[PDB]
Design a protein that fits this description.
- The complex is a heterohexamer, with three copies of chain A and three copies of chain B.
- By secondary structure, chain A is mainly β.
- Helices cover about 5% and strands about 30% of the residues of chain A.
- Chain A is built from three helices and 25 strands.
- Chain A is elongated.
- Chain B is mainly alpha-helical.
- Chain B is built from four helices and four strands, in the order E-E-H-H-E-E-H-H.
- Chain B has a two-stranded antiparallel ribbon. A two-stranded antiparallel sheet of chain B has the order 3-4.
- The two termini of chain B are about 35 Å apart.
- Chain B has a single domain (about 1-170), classed as Alpha-Beta Complex (Hemagglutinin Ectodomain, Chain B).
- Classes of the chains: A mainly beta, B mainly alpha.
- Chains C and E meet through strand 1, helix 1, helix 2 and strand 4 of C and strand 1, helix 2, strand 24 and strand 25 of E.
- The structure holds N-acetyl-alpha-neuraminic acid (SIA) (2 copies) and 2-acetamido-2-deoxy-beta-D-glucopyranose (9 copies).
- One 2-acetamido-2-deoxy-beta-D-glucopyranose (NAG) binds near residues 11 and 12 of chain F.
- One 2-acetamido-2-deoxy-beta-D-glucopyranose (NAG) binds next to loops of chain A.
Chain lengths: ~325, ~170, ~170, ~170, ~325, ~325
């Protein structure tokens, strides 16, 4: 007798999915929505390459630590790679004010142009040729100082005079700049370097005012210094002018950065991974992803277009039917 | 399976049927074999594809966590940032893991459903002219050649022309 | 459609039927016309209304974004605030856009299913006393007046009183 | 109910049937009574159990709000913290309240489906040897004793040995 | 022979919906859940009207810039509309400390009552009627000063004596008040105005203490001033007392606001939209919404009860069946 | 005729559930997923006991208010219960700097060990035996001072000499410690206590520097004090050293806490609920929860592993069939 039957597809598939009603269900066709593969390296993005701070910290780089000469000058970057146990940062002991807001502001950028903001010329009646210390050595001179700052002291002869400096930002770009205030360990060194008198460091901009006086005290020795420097930063906006004025204890700005900010969003990666000559559209702290998948369980930190991060190990959607072969 | 057809009053599928998801086994004097129903298969493919692409499309945003550091005097906002980023992570993880679980359940139902409707399509034509056997199959009470086999598959059988022989 | 009834082994709908969502079209010696099934229609209206109102009710909260400005030394909390506000926006956008996609799929399924269950209730009463024609319709093999048409619609037919009947 | 079986072309349930969710009520010369179908009931139990445990499992995280105080100069982060915590609260509240509403709708559908598939399993065996009556019941056109009642329940009826009498 | 058929509704609808399985599906009945239309204006809320800050910034309004006289006195508001190119703010150059927390605290309110907190009488042996400047003109006197502050200077031939003032908040309402500290451009002007000696400005409250000294330096010219004023604000809570004491450089509080804070949430809208004589239950930064719809794609910033904001352009739920006509 | 029928279970259940399609639906079996019961008390968590600050505030406890001797010494805690109207806190009027970050850091801990960080010995040529006040009484001496601090003053007729102190944290644990700076109400009392001359208080560690000078002014009377003390705290990390140096106005550290804080989650509960001798795995601000349920509408604040908090009053999942009896 003639037979006709109704039925459905099967194959040698063993790929399983889960449902609310049943776990481990074999189906004929499925699709994985989640990526968990990664090249373990850093690649360029928008073909712009990252900035490897190597054996420097952001602090070291942007203050101009002598041992960070490698990084000196102009820099372009798609993102920033800080290695976890980089040793060259703040050589001469002291606190960098608003460090976290600085590390974040720098992140929001993509290029800097180094430029002499205040020539040593600027400061009248003072010795800009000393201002050097073994807490801050180079690789060739075990007594140096930051490349973007000047430690101004009194001349052999005279009195530490009132000193003034001004800079009108006539350019199109905001300027990131730095200064400091020296806090000697005792009165003896205060007098040697800057002289008698109540000393001050004052700064001014259309939008901000800074003022501080030296805080003299011996503090625990760090790199053989029981003195300190309080470091500061700011952003001189386009059109604004900066006025400096002090009668002592000023670590003056010397070089500064013309800062162009990205309206992407940048990133600062603390990692051990190598930087290699490759492109990428998605780069995570733990590696680049190459995929069209919409989910990923690698890492929640990235730049570029990455898939949504989740804690699933698999997200497999069933497309075919139950497999019964 | 919820419609009862797949695994099943029709236990097991056909590895022999390669050209589709749902279809027919025929056997007659002229031979035998397997043939998919592409209309029901294709509109299923379009369905599932649209489902997958919809899910993909609707899931096509990303929450973005961030580098930023916090001082020892910033435990509170620090922890606030941590709680927020974990918060969205746990939410999206839930949304994705459960959506998969749900849609997979309903996807199987659809296939189950489409098979059943094929079974009843054929049963609606043959009637008296066939013995069921209640497992997807149909024994003809008459002689069904290949033009008759297509008759059943294109949904144009003709119960009148084989009523004669079926009684007998 | 998943249950097979709407568009369909019952191809096409009835603009003529104005008093409901599901029902009957009869033809006999006394006349012809269209009549909705209010029990299945009303029980559907209550369902869908409750579904819509439920969704509305459950969606009746609002995340509230905020005025507040942040200084040039507040890039971090500033950006934290935007990331949070965008975060909830993207979540609720997903929840709403996908819910609509899902429930719309299931809403159609529901109408499909309740048409089918109407089709099968009638089919369960008539049996041999009608020839199917496999498109929602039923040819009576006997004489069905208007009291007989209501017979079928109120679910109290009487297969015996018409077994004389379809004999031929 | 979406599959049409529960409340229902099978109006009402059986308080008499205590050993399961779905099953049979028979009456013959030897007596009458109620007997559950464990296979269909048990796989329903495992299904629902897996669903519940899945929901529980997928919901097994907690967003946790925090002690922390904020000064009169910290109105902004303070309010940010409040908006965030209320934000996740409103999200998880939605996800839970709606999931319940949805799954409850689908849970009932499942039971409805499992009854229907029992109904059609039996119908597939009894054939003509029973008159339907379209309410879950089956009148035998022949004499069905108790092992005959079990024949039907273990799915080995026989159409074979009762055509003879189906005639009559 | 007689016919009975089963079937379903149809109509002249062409309204479509989307499903997971199928896009653009015509149905017989549907409902739109998302609002996207808006009257582009600002309206009354709980029938309290907003506060239109003129050509003011909040700063100008609340410190009492002469050109902000329109806004002087008591004020009630459901919210606050600040215009994007408002010109009268801080006339005399300087920084308003914790500006963002102030702009936010003001937002949290619904009325203020202006009142003389410290009469010029309060300050002994000093001149309270000079204290006026061309950086801060009126519309009729091109040399004036803030209406809630007093620029106190020494009399012509005497010395700037210790001056003291106290105020006990015996009322039920918190008081928002303001002061400042003058920072002259050089020593010459310091001596003109206050005499010399180390000057100070000190304040005290059961819960707070303030103390600062003048930081003398020339800064970039703003409204022809190379001097500066650091402005400050605070809230004297009910029951507490405020003590003022200075020997120079004090810009003293004069008037202040009895502040009544909101129980709802406040708002500060930066916009160009007109304020008109209408009510509303939902007012967004880009316009009022009139609807019962539960979703809306206009804006996430509002006050009153608005629908949930989403990025969808449509959210239409199907209620009827597929239309096959 | 013999009949066999298909059907479904029913029972005496009246328990109802909700669906998208139908509210109040009676079913045969269901399960409640949401807990709303709570023992209204505080219990041990992981057998660890809470710390009842009783009639002290955190400030009072950790500064060593005399009336807070009950809490003196070593302490272990699961969380911290501060009662809402505790009256012993900062006895001598003044602000505790970064109070919120301190209250948070302490919360981040589980035990402290009290220890003499700076013996009174440490300070040469000064009277460490007075430095006591009626604003800070004991229960037995109506004029005392904090137990973790020393109010150092001049000896009868010598002058307040430079005083120095150092502590090397050689232990494995961070040290939480405290100091202050006295701000006299006038010049007369300044000279009584510390002598004339511009005074200072300076602190130092490898990672931080502190320096401030007395701000002399009369401020509103609190506990009969019109002077003030600015209190400060810090954490000396393991390996770090602290240098103290002043010539007046120093409220010196005396005792401090070896702070061990694990990777908990910590809590500080502001509540009146009793602490009783019970265990618990989930403890909320408003009570302990005992349940296996995955949801709960009691409170969003807890420690231990609690169910997810939601605003639902019920979350009942249907397991059985529609009940039709
Ligand atoms: C004079 C000068 O500018 N730097 C000198 C410093 C500073 O006097 C101290 O760092 C201040 O405490 O002392 C030394 C040193 O540490 O290297 C020599 C160095 O030239
Ligand atoms: C000497 C001392 O340590 N405390 C004394 C205080 C304060 O020193 C000053 O009043 C500063 O306001 O003054 C008195 C008082 O009425 O409280 C008595 C008390 O003995
Ligand atoms: C599985 O069967 C497929 C049918 O598509 C065949 O092509 C393939 O080679 C087989 N593979 C294995 C591993 O058995
Ligand atoms: C399927 O079951 C196997 C063991 O039977 C298990 O190892 C595997 O993890 C299960 N699938 C998933 C996705 O977990
Ligand atoms: C469309 O149908 C409605 C009734 O549903 C009717 O009122 C309206 O006039 C119709 N439109 C046209 C153009 O006929
Ligand atoms: C239907 O598709 C058309 C394009 O064919 C599109 O213009 C329209 O927006 C779609 N409908 C909806 C509701 O999105
Ligand atoms: C403020 O005034 C009230 C008088 O009603 C008084 O009780 C309170 O002590 C006063 N405060 C001060 C600091 O004088
Ligand atoms: C800065 O330079 C421009 C002219 O190049 C001028 O408009 C402005 O006055 C200058 N600013 C100052 C403070 O000199
Ligand atoms: C409900 O039914 C149970 C059996 O399931 C029975 O033992 C009990 O007595 C009944 N009680 C109530 C309160 O209905
Ligand atoms: C069920 O409805 C009744 C009133 O009919 C009401 O008292 C009860 O709160 C409702 N319960 C649920 C779970 O919906
Ligand atoms: C602290 O002690 C260790 C070991 O005793 C020593 O190596 C270190 O130099 C000391 N620190 C200071 C600042 O003396």
């Amino acid at each position: 007798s003639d037979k006709i039957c109704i039925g459905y597809h099967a194959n040698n598939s063993t790929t399983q999915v889960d449902t609310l009603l049943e776990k481990n269900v074999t189906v004929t066709h499925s699709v994985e929505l989640l990526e968990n593969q990664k090249e373990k390296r850093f690649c360029k993005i928008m073909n712009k390459a990252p900035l490897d701070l190597k054996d420097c910290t952001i602090e070291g780089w942007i203050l101009g630590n002598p041992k960070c000469d490698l990084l000196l000058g102009d820099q372009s970057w798609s993102y920033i790679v800080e290695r976890p146990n980089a040793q060259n940062g703040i050589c001469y002991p002291g606190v960098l004010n608003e460090l976290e807001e600085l590390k974040a502001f720098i992140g929001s950028g993509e290029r800097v142009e180094r430029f002499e903001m205040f020539p040593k010329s600027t400061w009248a009646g003072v010795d800009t040729s000393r201002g050097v210390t073994n807490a801050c050595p180079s690789y060739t001179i075990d007594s140096s100082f930051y490349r973007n700052l000047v430690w101004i002291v009194k001349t052999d002869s005279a009195t530490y005079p009132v000193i003034k400096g001004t800079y009108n930002n006539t350019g199109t770009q905001p300027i990131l700049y730095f200064w400091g205030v020296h806090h000697p360990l005792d009165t003896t060194v205060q007098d040697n370097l800057y002289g008698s008198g109540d000393k001050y460091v004052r700064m001014g901009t259309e939008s901000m005012n800074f003022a501080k006086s030296p805080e003299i005290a011996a503090r625990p020795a760090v790199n053989g210094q029981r003195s300190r420097i309080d470091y500061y930063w700011s952003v001189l906006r386009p059109g604004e002018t900066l006025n400096v004025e002090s009668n002592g204890n000023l670590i003056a700005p010397w070089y500064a950065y013309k800062f162009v900010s990205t309206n992407k969003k940048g990133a600062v990666f603390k990692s051990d991974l190598p930087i290699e000559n490759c492109d990428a559209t998605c780069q995570t702290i733990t590696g680049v992803l190459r995929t069209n998948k919409t989910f990923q369980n690698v890492s929640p930190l990235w730049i570029g277009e990455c898939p949504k991060y989740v804690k699933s190990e698999s997200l497999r959607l069933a497309t075919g039917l139950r497999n019964v072969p | 399976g919820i419609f009862g057809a797949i695994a099943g009053f029709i236990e097991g599928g056909w590895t022999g049927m390669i050209d589709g998801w749902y279809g027919y086994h025929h056997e007659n004097s002229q031979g035998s074999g397997y043939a998919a129903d592409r209309e029901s298969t294709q509109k299923a493919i379009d369905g599932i594809t649209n489902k997958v692409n919809s899910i993909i499309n609707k899931m096509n945003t990303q929450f973005e966590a961030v580098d930023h550091e916090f001082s020892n005097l910033e435990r509170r906002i620090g922890n606030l940032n941590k709680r927020m980023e974990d918060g969205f992570l746990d939410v999206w993880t839930y949304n994705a893991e459960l959506l998969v679980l749900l849609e997979n359940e309903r996807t199987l139902d659809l296939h189950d459903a489409n098979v059943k409707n094929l079974y009843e399509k054929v049963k609606s034509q043959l009637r008296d002219n066939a013995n069921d056997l209640g497992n997807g199959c149909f024994e003809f009470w008459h002689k069904c050649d290949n033009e008759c086999m297509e008759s059943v598959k294109n949904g144009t059988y003709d119960y009148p022309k084989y009523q004669k022989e079926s009684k007998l």
